[model samples]
Target: GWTGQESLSDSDPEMWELLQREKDRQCRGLELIASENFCSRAALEALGSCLNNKYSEGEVVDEIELLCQRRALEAFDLDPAQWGVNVQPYSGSPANLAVYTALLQPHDRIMGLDPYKLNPKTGLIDYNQLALTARLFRPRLIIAGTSAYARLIDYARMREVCDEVKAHLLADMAHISGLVAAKVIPSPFKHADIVTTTTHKTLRGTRSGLIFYRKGVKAVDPGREIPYTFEDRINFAVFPSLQGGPHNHAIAAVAVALKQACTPMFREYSLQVLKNARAMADALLERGYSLVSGGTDNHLVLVDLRPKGLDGARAERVLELVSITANKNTCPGDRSAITPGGLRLGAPALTSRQFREDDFRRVVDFIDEGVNIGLEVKSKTAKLQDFKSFLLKDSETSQRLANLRQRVEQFARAFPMPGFDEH
Candidate 1:
């Protein structure tokens, strides 16, 4: 018999302790990254559960597939006849690619949004460009949304354009599904023909994928006259076309998360995510850091770093030094990818950890301080000698930033990260 590794007691307790300590450290620190969230212990347990051994592939595996499909369908609140659940793909990108493969043909035109920045290089899609591409390429289907970056998507307008061209509309609400599920934002799933999302992020589930379709789209053909509906198309694409076997554990976890999401507490959590984001945006604006689109209506905000004289890349580094983690982003009309003009911050994870309005305000203040520090570095690098003396002499701004950072640490220490006993 193959022997398992040493027991927990025999393992490096110090290393485990350090890992827990790191978790505590992050818990005590402000989390402003928009695409992150805290999954419940139930979700985590399901992910780590025994269902990982199952090899489910369509109805041929029959029982396992049926059970997984049932769990998934119930979780998403979709009828089995109209909606399908595929628990195969390991992540979002492949799931998206599978959707494209099932619905599209080669050289088929697909349109995305024209992101704010010209020549933008990020995950955010540009609807205007997508429309133009649809018109020019004549794609059989056009996907009109995103998984990263928070900006208002005009689903009605996008659907209208798709209708004129007789193209299918696929709205990827992977990043905003929690908002949509809670009715905080308009439902793209209601408007678009096909909608795809990941179960994680704002949805607060284990890492997984979920796809939804409106009442009447055709599914891909599977040679066996296999229930050709939108549901079947997605189901087959996920099982046969993309993945071999389903991750039953992940599916179970998704199910638990879905159940939680259907509750009033989840709705409150979703609303609070937006409130915290708005509070952070307001605080940032007060500190002179400009935000893209002026402010946010959701759980994320994009801070334009140009006013601070630092690009996104440099600003990201500065924030990291103080234990704040976020991604550098391109502002509308940005020319660089690595060092764009903006930083994307979100409140989902922080909110999940029970951060309130005051916490968001404090987080923004820390960001402002970090940004000012970055600006000073930028000014000094530019050899603005005359400005340098004045900038350094301004103890007021420096003192304010230092004080804000101190307060952030204090607040974070008080909250502690979820899942851990103590910080």
Candidate 2:
């Protein structure tokens, strides 16, 4: 009813207030969630732009989409002649689903390893076991990725297993695509038949996804008689099979982010992410915490809280009270996903804000303090409800939480939050 010129605060005070508060929270906390990062101001501007008004369903060769596709391939140094990309799936989940929808029918088996069984002792993937499983299951598609694994995947071994089983290899590099783009880690693109990644996580773009499939003749195959139709099949799957009317604003943002990803600074940032994770992992280990793989070679670390007589839910809640954000995870040997015994920490978000190895070591100190408090509270209360009350409501424990909360606020506020000009 009102003029379009009205500001958000004037027209939608309720939503604006919530957004402001969330901004405040983000500014004043330690964000260690593994799948999160802050995008640049240019990327955010694209996300909020008026390009969202368009509808390009079934349209062939739109420039923005084509530009994004080119940038997506360019980020990982893929030759556009040999590879084709679709930059239209909504996010990583839909991106992966679209790949499955494109190539496999219902009741076709999907093959993937259990997180804990990859390597129980060393916390690494057991390639022999994987090959054995693939042989027995004979899955139509094999997914070579993980949400919580801390090491670099062996794409070569995965490719071998896929070949042995005659399965399509879908490398879901959603977590480490930025590292791959920067060449900080090994790339699965060379071995994977189809690769999928989300734009947000390590890519640090808007919430969207990209699907890259092999084009041209088959490089090596038992089916060498046929050329590849993966490009057309995947494009159709994303456009009409799974979703319609691609998010143009998101595509624009992805284009901007992908361009930035190809820059030298992004490479430096990706390397620093690995260093920061190692620093934090070493610090936690020195403090007697059990790291899932004994250490990390990537952007994340998984802490087995059971060794410290702590549960992840209690530790995560206590950390949140102190303005340190992390997520509870299901560790190997965990009985239930609801109340797991591990916490996953990541380095990408803090690294984006220019935190270095020493800074991450300091973050581990804060986490150690918070987890010690969680342990003390756990010794007193058996139930999570009781434990949360001690940290949130009035108590001596709450005072320590308040003290750490103050320190974390001061520490986090020292860094810039990338996109926003305000705190």
Candidate 3:
């Protein structure tokens, strides 16, 4: 009755085979979209390391565990005397929610930047909206930043607004932490009462959350001032109010990444990320695409596809078919929040793979070709005689698109995606 099947013949050996194949495909493919990167092999191995077995909760770890966790936090230049860490909850969302719950009471108003409005042209909140909201609702704290769009936020302005309204400032730098840290961009760290970020994305670390607080605050308990530092409150928030056990493996990997980021090569990498973005925007402009904010000063570019009479969703699908991955986005004048008239592209992923300006130019060419085909198909279906007439009148348009497509494919073939050698 307890007979076990031991035959390996029925097993699908091809599962691993297929997974490797996908890996190779990704490796060989050209990734131009931003907000992505290839983690280092060391970091990958750390995630799969044996530390997964440890279940020691807070105050239960041995000296070695404490040392490792302490090293991990210190690697990021976080001060231990002023700050403590709780390594639980798994990711950024929960970490943020925990901060909110720990710091404020129920129905307490919180101020956040008003996201750019798409519908009705211009009636929604911009950064200024948060100030008004804080003034009216009198939230205990104010949070400022952006998640979807990549732009330089006015942290000083947000801080001033918070101060005027007597609300605490919490700056979420999750999207651009790496830039802030490197001084490639302005930092909000000095102005905010609290700062939060994710180790992934531009930081090029493992998926994890980080919080930084100001030097002193009345909210922190006086008796618990272990070193009289901002870190004390942070440690308390993370350990007692928020998380339980720390993912030592992830922390180790983050330490490795932070070490790598400190090297000169990483500085070059950061600068190149910006360079690639500029080149991408220029290339898209040459192909007659419109970019939001005119262009980018960082690693991202947002394109408005309405000029081509196509929405963001259609553009994303067509590009995916050709192996170019990008996401739909909302433009300043979008009518819908989702599936709006825009596409977002970035340079971090491509830059991580050692791509340069020339490589981005080719990627932009491929995007233009994919988008043009999408436009052609859309026009054909709608029988929009005006589009056809315009194309025909501009004799060079079709020829330029055809040449650009051929060049793009040729260039793409040279960079091999991810696991080409494995294939």
Candidate 4:
């Protein structure tokens, strides 16, 4: 083969420069994004390998894809004879879209989790109310998943409701599949007819998705006499129907991550992730911060910012100024998603850096300072445009934020990142 084989820096300094700067940013800042993680070096290497050049779109299935399927099933202790997995979807939302498009027709009724699903007083999911809604609506499918939820789902209760309505239970465990694989949480495979998850997040893999479905008979059948299985339809939907070709590099990296997750070390990491979340929740509670659901059962906690007279937008802005990377989120009673009244924090990426409970408590202290700064800014102006000026302008608030960022950067640089090093 004739090729230049030039380095990225030599070929395109423009793009390579941004990559280097991003690496520095990630190393120097605290990453509390609930849906992100620092994947393993082996996974990164696999993602960058020659497999990325292959295109096996049609009937062809790569051996690494098969290995990924096996490891994905093995990580959850699912039997291949009973369950089948498709590792083709690009990411989480697409994986879910594939499931719905395959199993449902237009106008098919569905019950999914929303702010209304939470109890107003407790800020927890109301399974009783959900069951009653299912009975009344008689939906053909029910999606049990969450983006900002902080409590454990009662899969048994959901299964019972689905059984009564004969609806398909799709457990979208995008957030906590790693916890389930680590055996730190209850398995959804036993209850749900289909499962979908992103390979990133808690799994710490490259960005991808996995769709696991039952292999045998359909749980809820229409008037068909044969009672067809989902294996063929789901496979076809993932292939020529929905996706053209799969990312072989992602499949290989997914295999690497799944193998790593099968080890005792990864299990310990997953458990520590949970412990850190609880520690952060308790620390925030002790500091008079109101936590949605009162705590967390997984890797994320939602803090309601309304009591402090600050919006999540401003709180997130102040936290960003201090190099703490979290997102503004809508709580149960929030009006707008843009200026929502909550903050979502997660410990997966930091826990991946071997952060313990004590470190997470300190992280909470940092958040307390960040939010208090938000409050101070709010006392000056309630408008977001005015708030923007405060973070950038030469003021006492900006000076305090600069001091906080120095400490946060110092603390963050103490831990090691998994995939690469800027130094």
Model 4 gets an lDDT of 0.87
The lDDT of each candidate is 0.71, 0.88, 0.67, 0.87
* Candidate 4 lDDT, 382-409, residue by residue in tens: 5798887977884798899999999999
Q: Against the true structure, whose TM-score is highest?
A: 2
lDDT of 2 by residue, 381-405 (tens): 7678988887767578878888999
RMSD of each: 5.6, 2.2, 6.4, 2.6
Measured with C-alpha atoms, the lDDT of residue 339 in candidate 3 is 58
TM-score of candidate 3 versus the correct structure, residues matched by position: 0.79
lDDT of 3 by residue, 236-312 (tens): 66776677777877666665666666667777888998899899999988888888777887888888888878988
* lDDT string, candidate 1, 246-300, tens digits: 6777767777777777778888989999898888888888877787777887889
Candidate 3 global Cα RMSD: 6.4
Model 2 deviation from the true structure expressed as Cα RMSD, one decimal place: 2.2
Per-prediction TM-score to the true structure, in the order listed = 0.83, 0.95, 0.79, 0.94
Per-residue lDDT of 295 in model 1 = 81
User: What is the RMSD, in Å, between candidate 1 and the native fold over all Cα?
Assistant: 5.6
